[PDB]
Subunit: 149 residues, 4 copies
C-alpha cells in the first residue's frame, strides 16, 4: 500500500514526536531545577513551554495516525529517535535558557527539512502543521536570546 515517499513523512513526523517527548521532560527539568533571581520568571516560562510540548506531542502523533502510520509511543523509542539530548542536571539558569535556544534552533532546521519532504510527497497538511510549530519556535528563540543579552 504505502510507498517509501509516503512512509518518510510518518518517519519524519515521529522524529519530532520523539523530540517533543524528550523536551516535555527536559522542560520540566528546567522548570524544577532553575534557581537564582529569575527563578519565578523562568519557572513560569518553562511551564508555558512544556505545556506547548504536550500539545505538539498529541498533534504530531495524531497527524501520523491521520496519514496511516503508527506514532512513537514509548520512552525507549523516543530516546532512540530523538535528536534532542536530555538535561545534565547541573545547568545554571542561563545555561537552561541557552539550552532551549540551542534545541529550538536545531528543531527549526529539522522542521524545514521535514516540511520539504512532506511537500515533495504532496502532503501539504503535514507541512503546514510542522510550519506552525516552526513559526512558534522562531518567536521563542528571539525572546530567549533577548533575555540572554
Amino acid at each position: 500500500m504505502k510507498t517509501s515517499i509516503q512512509q518518510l513523512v510518518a518517519v519524519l513526523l515521529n522524529r519530532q514526536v520523539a523530540n517533543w517527548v524528550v523536551l516535555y521532560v527536559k522542560l520540566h527539568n528546567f522548570h524544577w531545577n532553575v534557581n537564582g533571581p529569575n527563578f519565578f520568571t523562568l519557572h513560569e516560562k518553562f511551564e508555558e513551554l512544556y505545556t506547548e510540548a504536550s500539545g505538539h506531542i498529541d498533534t504530531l502523533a495524531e497527524r501520523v495516525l491521520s496519514i496511516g502510520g503508527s506514532p512513537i509511543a514509548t520512552l525507549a523509542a523516543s530516546l532512540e529517535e530523538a535528536s534532542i539530548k536530555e538535561a545534565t542536571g547541573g545547568e545554571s539558569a542561563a545555561e537552561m535558557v541557552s539550552s532551549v535556544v540551542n534545541d529550538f534552533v536545531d528543531l527549526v532546521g529539522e522542521l524545514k527539512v521535514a516540511r520539504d519532504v512532506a511537500d515533495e510527497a504532496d502532503d501539504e497538511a503535514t507541512a503546514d502543521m510542522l510550519d506552525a510549530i516552526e513559526a512558534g519556535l522562531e518567536k521563542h528563540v528571539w525572546m530567549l536570546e533577548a533575555f540572554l543579552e
Copy 2:
C-alpha cells in the same frame, strides 16, 4: 538539616515520578492506538488519565524539591527506576483497560508502602499527597474493572 530517613522519602517519591513519566506516554499510547466500538469513550478516558498523569509528575517532583531532594527528570532515569512497563504496541482495547487496571493496582500497593515510610519519617505532607493519588487510582480501578465485566 534533613535526616537520612527524610532522604529515603525522596527516593520513594522519585520512584513514582519515574512511574508517572512512563505512564504519561503509555496512556498517550493507548489514547492513540485504541480502536473498536469503544474508541471514542476510551480515547477520551485515556486523555483524562494522561492529563492526571501530567499533574502527578509535577506535584511529585516538586514535593521532592520541597524536602530537599532532586527529582528524576530524564527519560533514561525514568525508565531505569520505573516499575511500570511500557506498552507493547499491540494491545487490544480491552487489554489496554486491563493494563491500566494492573498498573494502577501496582501503584496503589507502592503508594501504601511509600506513605508508611513517609509517616515514619514524620513527613505527613508527603504521605498526604501520596494518599490523594492513591484514592484517585482506587476509584479509577473500580470504574475500569466495571467496564471489563
Copy 3:
C-alpha cells in the same frame, strides 16, 4: 378524584424514589457501556433532584404540604425500587418502563389540574412530561 396537591405529591414521591433508583443504576451499572450509562444516570438523577424541588414547591404554592420523608415517599410512589441485580440493559429498560408510567400519570394529573383551573400546575407537569418523552425515545433507541 383527588386534590391537585395529592396528585402532585404522588409525583414528589415517585421522583424521590427515582433519585435513589437512578443513583443505584449510576453506581451498579457495568459492561462496555459503563461510562456512557454511568454518565446518563447522573444526568437523570440530577434532573430528578430538580423535579423533586419544583413539584414540592408547587404543592406549597397552592396551599398543600409536600411529601417529605422516605417513608411517605415509599408509601405513595407507584415506582418500584431497584432489585439490585439489574443488568445494564435491564437498567435502561427499567427507566424506560418507569418514564412511560410517569408520562401516563402526568397526563392524568394535568387533566385534573386543568379541571381545577390550575394551569400553572398543568404547565409544570407538562414540562416534566415532554422531557421524559424525549428521554424515552433515546433510551429505547439505545436498546434497539
Copy 4:
C-alpha cells in the same frame, strides 16, 4: 461488640445522607417566619452537600469492593438519623440539623478509626473531610440559635 466492616460503616453514612437529603428538603420547603429566606437558602446549600456525600460515600464503597445502600427501604433501615416530623418550627429545624450533624460527627470519628485500623486511609480521609465540614456548620448553626 462493634462493627468492623468498612463498607458496612460507609453504607451507614450512605443511609444517613439519603435520609438527610430528604430531611433537608423538608426544612427547605416548610420553614417559615422572618428567617425564611435565609434558612430556605441554607437548607438548599445543605441538601446540595448531602447529594454530594451520597455519591462519594457510595462510590468509595464500590472502590473497596462493597455494594452501596441504594434503596429508600434499606436507607431507612440502616440510618441512625430520624426523618422530620413535619411540624418543626424554624428554630427546631436548625436545632435538629445541629443534633443530626453532632451525631454524625461522633459516628464519623468511629468509622475513621475502623478504617484506619483496616489500613484504609483513603476511606478515613474522605470521612474526615465530611466531618470537618459538619463541625464548621455546627458552629454556625449554634451561633444562629444563640
